Symmetry: C5
Subunit: 346 residues, 5 copies
């Protein structure tokens, strides 16, 4: 008969002594808030800043016995966000926020419904820009584990405990793709219970494993740098004598493999250690410079070394030729059989 | 006689029991909100972020029988946005917001008018930065379908239903142009009715088909890369012997076609797969390197190969010359007759 | 005797029935709001975004007969912006806002004064980021006409009409300069009266004509590209035979004129059509490549062509020499006499 | 006995008729507000935008006789910023704001104290982003005079007058350094009294003279470009004949001096006129191209010009050699003795 | 019995005369506020702007005897941030703010608890963007000392004194890493007590010593520039005569060592003085140009200098050869034994 918003104003008003500043079960057991999120959007995972933007639906559930109506005939009284500052709510925050905001377009994007036994569902929409430290040792083949962690701010462990619900604690939207990554399905769920000189505060966290799309770096970086090493060798499939074809086509490989090494570290943070794209760009400069070093070894013989003198001339220039037709692919393919296996076992 | 704002304060005040926290037709059929937008501005369609900024007039229409006056002699009571928090409004939001805001310069840019039978028109001005996933397989010749979708947040399907009106559900402003795209006239209108563990919520969406302006990429990228392949061949329209004119003008084509390939992927997201500008830049490097590979094949003969010996010298250097005057345009024009037709049928 | 703020609180308070939610001359003729702006700052005219930032003083004047006091001895009651939400104000907005804001440093920068006959002056300070479509056909020699337009949002044409006052409808600050443009003095003033399915709404607009500073593009782009075409020709003022001075100094012009063509399209939007800086950079590559094409024509003769044979050798190499000393300036100066006149008549 | 905040609530409350909307000395002489600032931070002086960020303490002093208590035993009643909207304050603003904000971290950073005779000190903390037009004629050796100006917005000259106090009208923080500039100690203080069709409004302004740090541009730009002109000449300290050492080492100077000219105009606004770094980069390309022009003059003689014929050969190649060993430093050092003196007298 | 929020509303309400506008111990000794921070996040230490972003938990402790309850049986009454504007709080601010903000996601991230003896703990979460002047004399090997300083704004020294507590005045979060730096453990704690014409105000400050990660600059800059100096010398391990192998491989070192010098000063502020990466890039161009200067010295002999004439030819070309095989590593390794020791003692 009486409408619920009219019914609820006396359920939690100044009458019946409801004070929104006081947690449920006061001077009792701690409040068990159970949580689950729903990732709408995900991404812009910057590595210069080592953070990522996420857009979630944070659902929180607890039990307020002061709100447990009995006589109203329905099962779920909702509550618009205008009266949402009138009940108790948990003081959740994110321990690695780095700035975040609500969404208020056409209405505060907030949801609240109250069951008969005082079970309270509270769902809001948040955009977060969460920090995650990026480990870039094996850079195009890394698995980034960027986390997010949810803590109480004012209430300690003996007053308020966060939990993940067992019914799908992290859902992901259906067509959620990433431009550079794959969000794996297994999401680790564990506690991070903090300690300060103020006290100990509850924490729960989720761990998202992000595996890269290697195919972009394979297209822009590896495959052109693979062919210049092949360009380094067909220029050695060359005429009898030393020639300017052995000169300009050797420094051709120098200009390209440094250009590929210049544009390699374009959008990378200035990490102190060495990453996997470096030791590819190192060898793809080392085998480039070993093409000019063979021509100088030929020029060390072509200027140094009339039937006996001409026999001593080609007694060295072909001992160096028929080996480097074989030795250059041997040391290169023994590198790839050692390079790729290390980055396909980690 | 009595002014409408004075008349309306008793129409929806504490007298006559109007509660703005309660939807129309409560414990009845769901509220049928019908919607249409008006795109003022559109654009800044970034592909690094995969989003786009739009500036709309969101019109919403529904029926509140509590507001249906009968005795006032007019037909449309308006209402300034100062008293706009005093009636019920739908809690619409955008499922791919990524940040949005109102416009409050000189007045809240909001409109509200109420007919005699309780029909309510509600128009606001919003700037949205909506996410859309970009498919870039055939990159300069793609048709991007970026959508926008309008959902309820608190009310489920049995309480509130969104509809597009049949009288022009998406209007576009008159001189609305795009810097890089063409907004097609046919705009798909369909439902995206969501399901959560909270419940099922209404959704309607519009699908904007965006076809690119190919002419910019044709000017900067294709036409210069077309002429270097022609530059690759007039350098083969060359003198009798091998010459440094066949040397420097061949690596000239190497420096330019990599420069055109360097500046090609300037503002592109790091997509894993391969796009259509790549397989043009691949062939426009492959036919470049097949110009130096012919000179090395000549230098493989010019150093290897006195009337019989000089007849064997030109017995190969012209068998390779008169074929590549014909074979280079044959394999190039058989590429364009296969390249362009695939990107003119999709 | 009684102070004006005390006098005004009863002039527009709950006594005397003044309702700020109701326009003047209600159920009468429409309100004639007359407007004029004062541009303090202007600029940051971006072409990537196709917008520009302006900082104005928006003055609005109308007549509220409810505010027409008679007995107070002064002529202009002012009103601080604290009580500014207490009278009726027009709901002006900008139809191409793209974000805007007020200025509230040390005080709301707002002004309000009321004459005896109810004439109301209302002046505020706004920063606007207004969109204007940029036509870039003749790019360094274009006249951009970027507009701004002022509309009502809630009131239709039969309730509220905007006008420009005839006494200087747009003033400009005294030392207002632009970094790249010249704001012309003639400013077009016309109507843009909108029509929607909601109704028809008033509009007035001003049109600012912006002519560029050509001298920057003449310094960085034209004058260096002019001298390389002269560098293309003094390298043809060369010795008798073919020489490497005719080789490296020809590709010198290739590297520079592409470098000038690379840095040409640095900060430009990706317009589909072709602009005037392109067809200068096209010809300044075409006459560059016609310098190497003459050396290859010489090398087509120097390898092809003993007193009769040496007479046939210079029977072609000087027929090509003494023409290109004349033909290269003839086709170049016939280009400038056609290029510049088209861009000095539009 | 009675605490001051309790004492002050009746000093300026509804009792004793204090109205915060009414200036002191109403219908009397104008209010003399005296001002002084304290620059905490200064800088980020961008020249693309032609503005600069400053962080000040704006102190304002005036006299309100309505606030002049007599009987309370102290000398300075302070007032927290919660009650700061309760007294009259001047409506100061900045005529070249371009966006500004207060600081509200942990408390509104605002200060207010009231002496016995109604003298009121009012100090706030503001961050400003002030526009200043940049004159860049002599660019690395310029003295920029960027100003800031403080005006009233609502009160005209006959009601409110701004003054600088004579006791240090602009203080600067102690260790305030600039990354690229030197703030000179002499700061000009003068009026800029505005006139509008509204009326005439008070203004005071301060003029900050900013002299650059020339040493950065001397390190990156001048000293490398100085040595290439020396590199241009040691390559002329060369062997007897024409050689490829006179070829590649000449175009070496072309590639570097254009690279230094490319990176010169990296962060500069697109000013129409010519600046001082240009006419250094012009001459440091002109003397570069006069090194290749001498080799072509030698090649004009080395191909043109057997005991009499060999005497005529070196009768020109050494007349050009021993002059350019002297003429190149003579015209270069006569340039620096004219270049630097003009930019060391202005 | 009575709940604390109900108990506290009469403890600090209008009854019992608590005025939040009045400091504790009024007309008494100054309030001793003791402080400690907790750095959650740290970084984005920009050097273009010379600032850094930090995310702290600011804890403040003082004693308000007006709040000292006696009869309530607990020891710590908390207080939600809704009623937080109802007690006295210190007006702390940061003397080098450059913009800062609170965090209000899901709740104002603020904490307040009150002991029995009026001890008040007050903890808030702030994001700061603090300015620090960067000294870059020895740039990759510098120790930056960026500070933060906490001052009162309204209360002078005789009313409010800040202190660091002796129990860990700066804590740092556990896994706090930096992308480019190492935050040292020793943090200097000292006073910075300000003086103005207003009065003298309290200050405390903390000094964070930041030592760089040298390994990134060693990977990108030093190690490639080390090998080009080795590339400069193996090209001198060359054949007998002068050769184009001594020509192109010498200017190869010119192009790379300027490319490494171009990309060196990529993200650096325009400091006037010279930094340590410059005098490495200077010498790594000087020993590059001393490779071409030896070839020109050989070409000064190879063109100048038949059994006696050929003995005088190699009487100089090997006196210059066998010295530069020894003199080039001697002057280079005597540089590193002087370069690195200066930057490993400071
Ligand atoms: C919130 O969740 C926590 C954890 O599930 C609940 O705390 C637990 O409450 C139960 C009963 O309320 C306690 O069990 C009792 O333990 C005593 C001592 O071991 C034993 O003698 C009894 O027979 C009974 O088993 C349990 O100890 C306690 N655990 C902790 C860590 O406190 C809490 O009750 C929940 N609160 C609400 C409002 O749901
Ligand atoms: C909002 O729009 C919906 C959909 O148009 C309306 O729901 C429909 O309402 C009609 C009559 O109110 C229902 O028709 C009736 O259906 C029963 C059972 O099929 C039949 O026996 C009756 O003879 C009559 O045809 C219809 O079923 C119902 N559809 C749904 C899906 O609920 C709703 O009434 C509208 N509400 C308002 C306030 O306009
Ligand atoms: C605001 O400005 C508009 C336009 O100037 C005013 O509307 C005009 O008002 C005049 C008199 O109020 C009307 O003139 C009358 O027209 C009738 C029919 O033509 C004629 O029989 C009368 O002798 C007289 O000339 C005029 O028609 C009307 N124009 C329009 C387009 O409505 C309006 O009155 C102004 N309102 C205020 C409050 O100043
Ligand atoms: C604020 O400062 C202004 C400027 O200092 C003050 O205005 C000046 O006030 C004095 C006395 O109040 C005026 O002096 C008188 O001038 C008349 C006519 O010249 C002369 O006959 C008298 O013997 C006396 O010298 C002076 O003219 C006036 N100047 C202006 C430009 O108005 C003003 O009084 C100050 N107000 C306050 C509240 O301090
Ligand atoms: C806040 O901290 C300051 C500094 O610790 C306290 O000021 C100090 O207060 C003590 C006693 O209240 C003063 O000691 C007395 O000094 C006089 C003169 O030297 C001496 O004759 C007495 O026998 C006694 O030792 C001390 O001088 C004073 N120091 C200063 C610099 O003022 C202050 O009391 C603290 N306030 C609170 C509320 O805790």
């Amino acid at each position: 008969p009486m409408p619920p918003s009219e019914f609820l104003d006396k359920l939690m008003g100044k009458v019946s002594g409801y004070d929104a500043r006081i947690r449920p079960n006061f001077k009792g057991p701690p409040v068990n808030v159970t949580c689950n999120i729903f990732i709408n959007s995900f991404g812009s995972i910057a590595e210069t800043t080592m953070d990522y933007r996420v857009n979630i639906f944070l659902r929180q559930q607890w039990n307020d016995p002061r709100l447990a109506y009995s006589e109203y005939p329905d099962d779920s009284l909702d509550l618009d966000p205008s009266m949402l500052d009138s009940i108790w709510k948990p003081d959740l925050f994110f321990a690695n926020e780095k700035g975040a905001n609500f969404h208020e377009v056409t209405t505060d994007n907030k949801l609240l419904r109250i069951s008969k036994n005082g079970n309270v569902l509270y769902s809001i929409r948040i955009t977060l820009v969460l920090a995650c430290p990026m480990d870039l040792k094996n850079f195009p083949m890394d698995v980034q584990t960027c986390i997010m962690q949810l803590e109480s701010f004012g209430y300690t462990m003996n007053d308020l405990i966060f939990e993940w619900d067992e019914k799908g604690a992290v859902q992901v939207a259906d067509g959620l793709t990433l431009p550079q990554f794959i969000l794996k399905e297994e999401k680790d769920l564990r506690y991070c219970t903090k300690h300060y000189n103020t006290g100990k505060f509850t924490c729960i966290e989720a761990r998202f494993h992000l595996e890269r799309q290697m195919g972009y770096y394979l297209i822009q970086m590896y495959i052109p740098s693979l062919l210049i090493v092949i360009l380094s060798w067909v220029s050695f499939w060359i005429n009898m004598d030393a020639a300017p074809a052995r000169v300009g086509l050797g420094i051709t490989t120098v200009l390209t493999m440094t250009t590929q090494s210049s544009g390699s570290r374009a959008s990378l943070p200035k990490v102190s250690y060495v990453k996997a794209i470096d030791i590819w760009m190192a060898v793809c400069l080392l085998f480039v410079f070993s093409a000019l070093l063979e021509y100088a070894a030929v020029n060390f013989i072509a200027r140094q070394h009339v039937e006996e003198m001409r026999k001593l001339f080609i007694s060295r220039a072909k001992r160096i030729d028929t080996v480097s037709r074989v030795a250059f692919p041997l040391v290169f393919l023994i590198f790839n059989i050692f390079y790729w296996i290390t980055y396909k076992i980690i």
